[PDB]
Amino acid sequence: SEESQAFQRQLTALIGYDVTDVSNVHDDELEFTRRGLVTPRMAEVASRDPKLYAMHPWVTSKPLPEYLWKKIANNCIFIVIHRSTTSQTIKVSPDDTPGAILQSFFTKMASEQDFVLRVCGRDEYLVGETPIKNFQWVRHCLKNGEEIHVVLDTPPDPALDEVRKECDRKFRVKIRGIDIPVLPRNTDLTVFVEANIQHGQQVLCQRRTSPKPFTEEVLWNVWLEFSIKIKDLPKGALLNLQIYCGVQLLYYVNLLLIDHRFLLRRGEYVLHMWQISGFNADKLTSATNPDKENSMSISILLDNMPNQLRKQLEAIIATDPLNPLTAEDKELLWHFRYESLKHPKAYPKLFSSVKWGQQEIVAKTYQLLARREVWDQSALDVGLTMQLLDCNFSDENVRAIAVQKLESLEDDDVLHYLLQLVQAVKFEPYHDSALARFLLKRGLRNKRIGHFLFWFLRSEIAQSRHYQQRFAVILEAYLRGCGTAMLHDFTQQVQVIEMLQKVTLDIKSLSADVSSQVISQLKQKLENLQNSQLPESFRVPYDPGLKAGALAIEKCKVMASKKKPLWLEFKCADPTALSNETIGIIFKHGDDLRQDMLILQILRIMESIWETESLDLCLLPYGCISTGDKIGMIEIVKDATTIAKIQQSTVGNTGAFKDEVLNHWLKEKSPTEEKFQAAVERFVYSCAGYCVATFVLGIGDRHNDNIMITETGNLFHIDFGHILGNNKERVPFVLTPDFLFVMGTSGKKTSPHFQKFQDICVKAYLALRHHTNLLIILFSMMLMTGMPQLTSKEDIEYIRDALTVGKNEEDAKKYFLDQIEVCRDKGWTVQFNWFLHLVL
């Protein structure tokens, strides 16, 4: 039992936070939340079949795309089984279950026990009752023109990931005063306090204090009387106290007026507040600043139908999420709420039209909710679901119908949206929520989700004071059920990257290009690191199937980059592997990688969209995990080099590029013209996607040292640090002459390979528009929870313009096709400027 409090200190150092340390509380919610979560932990743990859990087959139920059938002939597929030296090679119909070849070997291909299949190099299996074309690896092996390879061998023990044993008065708030140990500001202003009663961003009522002289301490002793009545207070309503000084918002804090037990909140409070750098999901947190020594305090006290209408209505429900409802709109929605209830696409706007500070309306709402059979019968729409989980919605019951829909989703989709679901917790009123528990079950039900959940949650715990307590209670909850096997890996992973962050920082300090000492100085630390203290092997945090062991010391180097990042390379710890070729991770302090994760994941989202219309655009949305404060890792795509550096090779230090160089570099890397096609093939496709992807996301305009290509023609962008920073010469995105001559064209021409691009984009762009709503919610959500300095809605209204909302298919492609021209009619103009900016 003191061995039980030894392991709680394990739990702690994995999390990077102490979920017992009641330093920064003023109620029992976090604990109550620890307690509250034990049930769903134990439930899902129990429900889970430990065999399939231990092997976590990674499977989809989606159609095999119309782009990926055409890589098969005669509806059979090769699967090269291996053993100690031995190796056979079976034909297979793309429906053969893993079980449909337990007999095509131990019997047909030539008492006995049971042993099952595993991909070569990876902790990645082919088990359970799924077609063979429904395993994600196979589809990849196919997609990339690769060929399967697996190892017959013993299943992993289900005993390994064992889990350990176990009133009609108006509301009144007294403002006593505010206190700061030092008042940094030297111009003596005045300041007042603004008490806002709030619900999901709607202010319900607002009362200020009388301005006073600003001093290190200011007392008012005043009751502020609100017009709202207590009866009318809705669970989740937030008391938002804010310090203004004249005008400017310097400090905010929040207190859930109704506690996690539905109790009105009675008492004396001293609340430590957050300052305001220079909406945002941080403005919403029930967390108080844990830095009591520097933070400002406040001190408070609480004692206690026609045509045109149906038309009008439908024209409202047919707008985007970002379209702002007028009062007329709202009253119309509310009055016709029962008709509105028939269309699930109206749910967001409908519930946005509820007067939430009015007890009897909420009632009527809550009964309107009890008649959503139509909702309950609709096919899941992630966009819509998502949209009810955002900052605009703060009622449990509503928020719960959303989480209801997410329950349908198969694991392959949870993975797709996991990052943004995790961030969506930043908008939950309460630490315990349907969303948090839904993340939990799924976390525990499937090891893959489980892995990434850990890192997602841990990422935020490391660089958010506004949310580390809450995410920590959920992380702890996860770990208490993931099992000993994963506990193990997790602690292993944490060691490596801690071990390695150490190394990255020291190296920055030594530098402000490269030293002779610094390369061998690094070399010396990396030799010392391997010398004793590193794990025999660790799971690659962004590719969990893939264990890594020894450090190819000779190949690791400090990059000649802006900050000083470590190019590392690693030997694979898995003998059965298909190669000697290493695993390449970049480590980096200096940027916020949380922004890169977000954008990368959106990119994956954009792939899958295209999968629905059997498009494929060969993006490389590479691995990237934020792991701590301005510090995380990135996956190295092997064989790649940035455009900028393909410019130094032929042409050097500065200057406009030989529009041909790229293709020489290409033909230089194609061994056969019988491959080279595959290069400019890949390129024109890959070029297509990142152009669409970027303009849409508002990050197309980029220097070409931030744009890469593979020696097999695949092009991709990198480093998305604060590139969204808001009229000099501007280019919608990066389509430059070099990219063009590779197509085979000049400022007028039109190739058989260009028309293609000109065509294949427009296809890709309108494909995106079939999900206008989904992209808008994700992008909105991205700005509020990952890009600080994205204060304005003006920021958000980019995407709708970008996506040309409420417009005919055709006009759009004549919006888009022109965009490509601006880039044509610009060549290297803006690129040059970035050269004069990369030095200005």
Q: Which residues bind ligand BMW (CB under 6 A)?
A: 561, 586, 588, 591, 596, 622, 624, 634-637, 640-642, 645, 705, 708, 718-720
Q: Is 620 annotated as a binding residue?
A: yes
Q: Is 623 annotated as a binding residue?
A: yes
Secondary structure letter of residue 751 according to DSSP? -
Rounded-to-integer distance, Cα 27 and Cα 415, Å: 34
User: Closer to ligand BMW at the Cβ: 436 or 572?
Assistant: 572
The angle at the Cα of 86, spanning 81 to 87, to the nearest 5 degrees, equals: 30
Is residue 590 part of an annotated ligand binding site? yes
619 is in an annotated binding site: yes
621 marked as binding residue: yes
**Torsional class of 152: left (φ above 0), alpha (ψ -120 to 50), beta (otherwise):** beta
Is 770 known as a binding-site position?
no
Q: Is 588 among the annotated ligand-binding positions?
A: yes
Nearest to 428 by CA among 460, 458, 370, 471: 471
Supply the minimum distance, in Å, between the C-beta of residue 560 and ligand BMW. 8
Q: Is 622 annotated as a binding residue?
A: yes
Minimum Å gap between C-beta 664 and ligand BMW is: 18
Smallest distance from ligand BMW to CB 835, Å: 15
723 is in an annotated binding site: yes
Smallest gap, in angstroms, from Cβ of residue 424 to ligand BMW? 23
Distance of alpha carbon 768 from alpha carbon 609, whole angstroms: 7
**Annotated binding residue 721:** yes
10 Å CB burial of residue 817 (0-12, 13-18, 19+) is middle
Question: Least distance from C-beta 222 to ligand BMW, angstroms?
Answer: 50
Shortest reach from residue 567's CB to ligand BMW, in Å: 8
Residue 494 token pair: 């944490």
Is 626 annotated for ligand binding? Answer: yes
> Cβ of residue 590: shortest distance to ligand BMW, in angstroms?
9
Query: Which SS3 state, helix, strand or coil, does residue 548 take?
Result: strand
Residue closer to ligand BMW by CB (options 695, 716) is: 716
Measured from the CB atom, the residue of 529 and 640 that comes closer to ligand BMW is 640
Phi, then psi, of 172 in degrees rounded to 5: -130, 135
Say whether 796 counts as a known binding-site residue: no
Q: Is 645 annotated as a binding residue?
A: no
Q: What angle do CA 397, 398, 400 make, to 5 degrees?
A: 65
Of 225 and 639, which CB lies nearer to ligand BMW in the complex structure? Answer: 639
Whose CA is closest to 631, among 687, 579, 593? 593
- Nearest approach in angstroms of CB 262 to ligand BMW is 45
The minimum distance between CB 634 and ligand BMW, in angstroms, equals 5
Output 602 or 634, the one with its CB closest to ligand BMW: 634
CB 144 to ligand BMW: min, Å: 16
**Residue 596 or 795 having the CB closest to ligand BMW:** 596
Nearest approach, Cβ of residue 13 and ligand BMW (Å): 27
Task: State how far the alpha carbon of 70 is from the alpha carbons of 143, 688, 714, in Å.
Answer: 10, 21, 20
Place of tokens 């965009």: 819
Q: Given the complex with ligand BMW, which of 139 and 588 has the nearer CB atom?
A: 588
Query: What are residue 499's phi and psi, to 5 degrees?
Result: -40, -40
Alpha carbon distance 443, 418 (integer Å) = 10
Q: Which is nearer to ligand BMW, 432 or 719 (CB)?
A: 719
- In angstroms and rounded to an integer, the radius of gyration of the C-alpha atoms of the chain is 29
HEC-encoded secondary structure of 355-372: CCCCHHHHHHHHHHHCCC
253 versus 662: smaller Cβ distance to ligand BMW: 662
Here the tokens at position 504 are 């990255």
Least separation in angstroms between residue 784's CB and ligand BMW is 21
Nearer to ligand BMW, 4 or 511 (CB): 511
Cβ closer to ligand BMW: 395 or 635? 635
CB count in 10 Å sphere of residue 288: 24
Under 8 Å CB-to-CB from 552, ≥6 apart: which residues?
569, 570, 571, 582
- What would the DSSP string read from start to end of 656-716? ---TTHHHHHHHHH-S-HHHHHHHHHHHHHHHHHHHHHHHHHT-----GGGEEEETTS-EE
Query: 513 labelled as ligand-binding?
Result: no
Residue 624 marked ligand-binding: yes
Smallest gap from residue 813 Cβ to ligand BMW (A): 31
Answer yes or no: is 720 a known binding residue.
Answer: yes
Cβ atoms of 188 and 214 within 8 Å: the answer is yes
Say whether 192 counts as a known binding-site residue: no
- Using alpha carbons, list the distances in angstroms from residue 771 to 362, 681, 688, 768, 780: 31, 27, 18, 6, 14
Beta bridge partners of 300: 175, 269
Q: Report in angstroms how near the CB of residue 719 gets to ligand BMW at its nearest.
A: 4
User: In sequence order, what are the residues at sequence separation of 6 or more whose Cβ sits closer than 8 angstroms to the Cβ of residue 73?
Assistant: none
Q: Which is nearer to ligand BMW, 385 or 463 (CB)?
A: 463
DSSP per-residue letters across 765-827: HHHHHTTHHHHHHHHHHHHHHH-TT---STTTHHHHHHTTTT--HHHHHHHHHHHHHHHHTTT
Counting every residue, how long is the chain? 840
Nearer to ligand BMW, 127 or 566 (CB): 566
Residue with smaller CB distance to ligand BMW, 233 or 586: 586
Calpha distance 355→733 (Å, rounded): 43
Longest Cα–Cα distance in the chain: 91
Binding-site annotation: residue ranges? 584-593, 619-627, 716-724
Binding-site annotation: residue ranges for ATP? 584-593, 619-627, 716-724
